Symmetry: C3
């Protein structure tokens, strides 16, 4: 089996806020997950980070801290909230911080980025988002090429569904960006009756298609569920969805 | 279940012209179809539009009228056959007229198009065809963008197979044009042993692919059979093909 | 069933070189293949061309001879090794000679190529390779378009996996080049844990995708296993793999 993560936003923001994120960690371990993705927008709440760290450690889970933070500001400077967010993430027991790109300047100071990352013990993940600045193949390809040149402790999170918001083809993205991918965010996307894009659980067809996309990324890369998980028995549901994802490969 | 149409060309041009298109209406209704797509080229002489409209209504079907007319002439003017075809379609009972684009000029008179459409009671549908002028993604994107800006009462018919004639990817077309799609033409396409592209009935794999394409169009969009339906028992065959398409998507 | 070929490189180059390519023909015929693809690079010494041809004919197999030869030299001239390679292919009983493109010049002498090829019963196939000069859609499309204008009876070997090495989409390749394809090389490609591209046997999803790619090529085109075939029982392994390829197409 390949390593599987669950983004707790999958369970619904209201439910997660009400029950607290730490309460989902035993559920994830019991369902067979290897990693949890925490969500900054989902603490009620100023968290007991100590209690949260102890919970992750007890379950033997890896932990990704996901933030809506955009790395680069309109003005061309690294987001001053980067270090405060890294501290937050580390305090919660995360091994990775996941962010969006923001607006990549013509001249990014990746040396500066490195120095800030070096003050903390987290690998940085940068995810394609739904915006023009952070969600399009061309600028992301530029960022990852450069980042690799200066050898940053950073990797791409390839979000399968987000490309849809920028009318970018996931297959083309995978072909061009797949060598940089360290984490896959899985969701299916449909256009609803009013023409609006909405994230949904995968069909059997989507899953087979995702297996083909995964051929473009290093074998065994961690894959995350970030789509609705709703049902009366969340443990059994999560287990069945983890198994389906873990099984994707050659 | 999603609404399903059958294009009567599916039954074979010679057979349909022989028996007449009206004779297939009870078949379509009994087989579970919600619309009939009449084909201008399959009328053996001008129809009694009153008997036709009455037969369609008796069967509780809606009706798309399909013409091979190209909307824009080589010289950049609208095809003068547009309003005569709109009048014939409307008289036969259709809710939509389906046409091809023709050669979109540098400065298309979309206001004049709107004025002509406003004189009739049908929605205009423009389908991708098999030609360079009417069958390539870039020009169709330009057309539908400009039509939406003019707020015209028109939508795309997305023909899954026709892209093959222009060596365009349906997946790419669906990404770029999906927001505009109000009707889907379903057909599988193979290159035969002689080298010629031909429309064929879908395999299981084809249906799964089409399910993924439909994610790009508003959920529950009407879908039409436009591939060969040939056999000893057209009711049974039609019923099965309709059922497979009615439940595609969910 | 559609005709299936096995490229003998599938069995592992060292194993094949040591046993000789002729020793695999009974296996191919018993497992249900229609065609063997011989590999010039898998002859450990000069071939016994008469015994090879006799072994192919005994088994009732057809034969494609694969050469790493590049058709067009850097200086724009046709590779002078083409004639001896065509004769070698014929000596080994081949109905097709498969080569790489090389560097396509601005004004290739396709007329001369056609006159050369017309002296031979076999057909020339040009395969997409893993190089910029021979593995990119645009130049290959230019080659086949020029060949079609000159009315040459040559065709393409569409290698499904090779496109990955040049970061080219196989679906786009199949759309733009499909009309030219007379032979298909099947392999799946993944990035390994180290990030290196490697050719591998297909998953069920791969096979389903390949069925869709085949829609772009003339129906019934011969398709070849060109991916690892390893096991204690090559006969049953080969038979299962040939079967899965032979049934790919429309119902
Ligand atoms: Na090859």
């Amino acid at each position: 089996l390949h390593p599987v993560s669950i983004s707790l936003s999958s369970y619904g923001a209201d439910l997660v806020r009400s029950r607290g994120q730490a309460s989902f960690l035993p559920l994830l371990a019991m369902a067979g997950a290897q990693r949890v993705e925490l969500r900054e927008e989902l603490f009620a709440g100023p968290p007991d980070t100590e209690a949260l760290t102890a919970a992750i450690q007890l379950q033997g889970l890896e932990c990704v801290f996901s933030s809506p933070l955009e790395l680069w500001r309109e003005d061309g400077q690294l987001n001053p909230e980067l270090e405060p967010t890294l501290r937050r993430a580390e305090a919660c027991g995360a091994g990775w911080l996941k962010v969006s790109l923001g607006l990549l300047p013509e001249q990014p100071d990746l040396a500066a980025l490195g120095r800030r990352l070096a003050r903390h013990g987290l690998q940085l993940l940068v995810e394609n988002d739904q915006t023009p600045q952070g969600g399009r193949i061309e600028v992301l390809e530029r960022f990852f090429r450069l980042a690799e040149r200066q050898q940053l402790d950073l990797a791409m999170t390839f979000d399968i569904g987000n490309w849809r918001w920028q009318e970018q083809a996931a297959d083309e993205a995978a072909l061009r960006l797949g060598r940089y991918v360290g984490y896959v965010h899985c969701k299916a996307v449909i256009r609803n009756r009013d023409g609006k894009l909405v994230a949904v659980p995968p069909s059997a067809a989507d899953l087979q298609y995702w297996q083909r996309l995964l051929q473009h990324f290093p074998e065994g890369v961690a894959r995350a569920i970030e789509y609705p998980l709703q049902g009366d028995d969340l443990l059994s549901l999560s287990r069945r969805h983890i198994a389906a994802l873990a099984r994707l490969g050659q």
